[PDB]
């Protein structure tokens, strides 16, 4: 595997978008874990 520091970089720079318009409220509410049906169904434990 990638040991961080030994056989790979340490902290790696993150990927970012250069600014942007405000996402619509329904864009993230419909994917939120508490105010979306599919979000609620996915907000469950796993084993």
């Amino acid at each position: 595997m990638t040991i961080p520091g030994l056989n790979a970089p340490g902290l790696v720079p993150a990927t970012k978008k250069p600014a942007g318009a405000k996402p619509s409220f329904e864009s993230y509410r419909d994917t939120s874990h508490f105010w979306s049906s599919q979000g609620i169904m996915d907000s469950v434990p796993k084993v």
């Binding site: 508490f34 105010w35 609620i40 169904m41």
Partner: protein, 215 residues
């Protein structure tokens, strides 16, 4: 009509998994017979997030009730003089509990249950239904659905209550679509009962001179 209501699922351990029978809707589970699905449809719940959040609210209320029970015995317990105020208890239970409960439920019906249920009966699928918060304050949409809403509360404050005939009815019978009572009838019912209970709750004596003594 075709979907069998089911809100319980068994786990596969010792062969009990067959009890998750075919209940329609691509779901395997134990069919329920408590009518809660129809209750929620009447209330206007169309999503699962609403059910989740009202469940969380119910848990919060249960915690508050445990706290209240502990507080009212271990920190601040009332006296027998407080308990024996039967007149004020009746006044607050009539006007305050029953009356305001009926008034609040009538408001909830008039604002959230009539539009959602009417759209569902018309044929709008639950995804396209406008949300209750949108319906609560969008008076233009409520005027589109029930034309009397465009007149505001002036027909209430003035006694032109006949203007609200569309969403406050005495139709009776059963709705042909759902085969149940008209929700406009139920809203008018709860409003009338709220008025009746608030009127009844001003009977018994309290700190002020007016009122009855049951003795």
């Amino acid at each position: 009509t075709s979907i069998k209501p089911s809100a319980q699922v068994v786990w596969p351990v010792v062969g009990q998994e067959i009890l998750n029978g075919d209940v329609g809707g691509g779901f395997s589970g134990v069919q329920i017979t408590s009518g809660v699905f129809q209750m929620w449809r009447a209330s206007g719940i169309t999503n699962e997030t609403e059910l989740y959040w009202t469940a969380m609210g119910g848990l919060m209320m249960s915690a508050l009730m445990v706290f209240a029970g502990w507080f009212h015995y271990h920190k601040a317990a009332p006296k027998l003089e407080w308990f024996q105020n039967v007149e004020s208890m009746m006044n607050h239970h009539l006007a305050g509990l029953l009356g305001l409960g009926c008034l609040s439920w009538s408001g909830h019906q008039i604002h959230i249950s009539l539009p959602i249920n009417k759209l569902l009966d018309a044929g709008v699928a639950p995804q396209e239904i406008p949300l209750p918060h949108e319906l609560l304050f969008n008076q233009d949409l409520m005027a589109q659905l029930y034309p009397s809403f465009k007149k505001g509360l002036l027909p209430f404050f003035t006694l032109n209550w006949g203007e609200y005939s569309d969403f406050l009815t005495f139709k009776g019978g059963l709705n042909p679509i759902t085969g149940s009572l008209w929700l406009s009838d139920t809203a008018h019912h709860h409003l009338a009962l709220a008025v009746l209970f608030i009127f009844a709750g001003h009977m018994y004596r309290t700190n002020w001179g007016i009122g009855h003594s049951m003795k």
